[PDB]
């Protein structure tokens, strides 16, 4: 019952992507129960970066989501202590960008951590060329695993000039709850779409939405 209608996060976020140090913050609110969310980032150091901001947007918030038909919400059980999630998205043309996230609540409000390793992205290819045009929608799949909950998804970043670069996700969330205090859910299905209110500036400022639905087969 920590988590309320409404809520408010904040973010740090430091990583290097082909040896390109950067830092970003953000602030953001939404609401928990409905699976929707916005928030305000700014790179804060190494902007304006080299890299299309999209290999980063996936990394700014698993409380968001709208657990459906009954589903154990594993996010919303694990506070007041918290989660923590770790990912690698593998692009197909050789770049990886592997994520690791500490989520918090202090004083009401969702504190995330987050560092970044991005290596190999092609250095003719439209991540580092800027050549991207944002992630069509998604679906992930979660079950558990290792103690904590796996996910997959695979995601399709479309291209300026036409055609998809295809991305495979794999990560794990852990609980930082006493495992026996959890309800788990079986396995299901999380839909969402990201998406841009408004950015400026070379993405050095990106007001990112998401929502996300959790459901089973339909």
């Known amino acids: 019952?920590?988590?309320?209608?409404?809520?408010?996060?904040?973010?740090?976020?430091?990583?290097?992507?082909?040896?390109?140090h950067f830092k970003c913050t953000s602030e953001g609110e939404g609401k928990?129960?409905?699976?929707?969310?916005?928030?305000?980032?700014?790179?804060?150091?190494?902007?304006?970066?080299?890299?299309?901001?999209?290999?980063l947007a996936t990394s700014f918030s698993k409380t968001f989501?709208?657990?459906?038909?009954?589903?154990?919400?594993?996010?919303?059980?694990?506070?007041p202590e918290g989660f923590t999630w770790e990912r690698i998205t593998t692009y197909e043309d050789g770049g990886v960008l592997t994520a690791t996230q500490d989520t918090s609540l202090q004083?009401?409000?969702?504190?995330?951590?987050?560092?970044?390793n991005g290596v190999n992205f092609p250095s003719n290819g439209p991540?580092?060329?800027?050549?991207?045009?944002?992630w069509e929608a998604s679906?992930?799949?979660?079950?558990?695993?290792?103690?904590?909950?796996?996910?997959?998804?695979?995601?399709?970043?479309?291209?300026?000039?036409?055609?998809?670069?295809?991305?495979?996700?794999?990560?794990?969330?852990?609980?930082?709850?006493?495992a026996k205090n959890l309800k788990m859910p079986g396995f299901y299905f999380v839909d969402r779409k990201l998406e841009r209110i408004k950015e400026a500036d070379k993405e050095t400022y990106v007001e990112q939405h998401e929502m996300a639905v959790a459901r089973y087969c339909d």
Not at 33 to 48: F, H, L, M, N, S
């Open 1 to 20: 019952e920590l988590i309320s209608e409404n809520m408010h996060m904040k973010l740090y976020m430091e990583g290097t992507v082909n040896g390109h």
């Open 32 to 55: 928990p129960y409905e699976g929707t969310q916005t928030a305000k980032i700014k790179v804060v150091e190494g902007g304006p970066l080299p890299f299309a901001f999209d290999i």
């Open 65 to 79: 989501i709208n657990h459906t038909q009954g589903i154990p919400d594993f996010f919303k059980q694990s506070f």
């Open 107 to 116: 004083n009401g409000c969702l504190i995330y951590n987050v560092k970044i």
């Open 127 to 134: 991540v580092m060329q800027k050549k991207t045009l944002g």
């Open 139 to 178: 679906t992930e799949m979660l079950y558990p695993a290792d103690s904590g909950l796996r996910g997959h998804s695979q995601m399709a970043l479309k291209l300026v000039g036409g055609g998809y670069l295809h991305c495979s996700l794999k990560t794990t969330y852990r609980s930082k709850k006493p």
